[PDB]
Amino acid sequence: DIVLTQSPASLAVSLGQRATISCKASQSVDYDGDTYMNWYHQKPGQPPKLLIYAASNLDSGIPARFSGSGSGTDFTLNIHPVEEEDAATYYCQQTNEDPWTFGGGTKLEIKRTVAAPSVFIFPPSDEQLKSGTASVVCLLNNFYPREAKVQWKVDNALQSGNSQESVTEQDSKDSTYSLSSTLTLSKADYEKHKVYACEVTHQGLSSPVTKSFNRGE
């Protein structure tokens, strides 16, 4: 089996600049003057899409910012200049010998200017509360970079081990992320406290941002 090694596993490229992704094959994928190497990319929730076929041929419907090169065992995909929509995971594939094999993939992040999150907090609905559970939701909207600290303060005490985070993929149009933090408590533990707050720390915020509510009001 021909093993394909992609490098790097991930990279961040500035808007308008060049992204270079490598694929090394454990054997030659050349045959009779032709090279059997393809590049694909995949955006979240979608099937992969062909970019380059036979090492260096652009496919119809693909912008000419994508180009491929190399032969034998060393191959390169070039994206220049990168655009917001190029956030995706990129895969090489060899079709020279059975079984066909894929590279491990390269996740491309598009850089942009620092953008502080807008923060919203949501108390549990009355109808969930009646069923015996309280979900408290903290939302961080449209921020960059992805790294963010979301702490749950309950009567000004730090909570641990009872919240779960979820983060969107990088937005293909503005290159930001969004994040939700959900604090889950039983109804009886929820009633043990008055003030529920989520405190957000992020490179784009001068000082941490706190959104809170009083249980009941």
Added chain:
Amino acid sequence: VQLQQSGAELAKPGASVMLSCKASFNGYWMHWVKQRPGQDLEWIGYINPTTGHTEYNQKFKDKATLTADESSNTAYIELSSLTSDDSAVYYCARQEYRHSWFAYWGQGTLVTVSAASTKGPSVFPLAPSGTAALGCLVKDYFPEPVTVSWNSGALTSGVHTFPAVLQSSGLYSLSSVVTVPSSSLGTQTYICNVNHKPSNTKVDKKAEPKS
């Protein structure tokens, strides 16, 4: 063209599962590709629907069986002896004669291997307060996936539907949020439309300022 794959499946450990892919006048090969959640791509094998000839990745020789019905241009894959490692998205892809690449892919079929039973979600509003945020908490369903739209698909800008997380109960949960002009909260109705096909449940929930 297009490749239409069958819907998401839930199957118990040790059972079998058959997935289908319908293409909608030439020779071509139907390949199948496995992608585990957030992971790499594995080539399973291909079949020629004209001759019925198949080739398998040796790693799937005992796991997968490829079948084609040329009468309706439908290709099938049978996965047997299912384990947790078989939970993944399975794609069908078409290779045209004279091509050494995939020209079209199906949208993929999610297979979940678990003894847990199907359960539909509960939907709770995330009630708002010049920009407001509102949303819906989609809680306690199994298996993946669930689809969320807003105003029957009319509202798409500003929508974020987060990836689901497995809760301590073993059921999935997600939230879908949208930012809207804060001045439209008293005039505009915002309804989330939740669809969970594995349990055949569709729920509409109004997200509005709490009384």
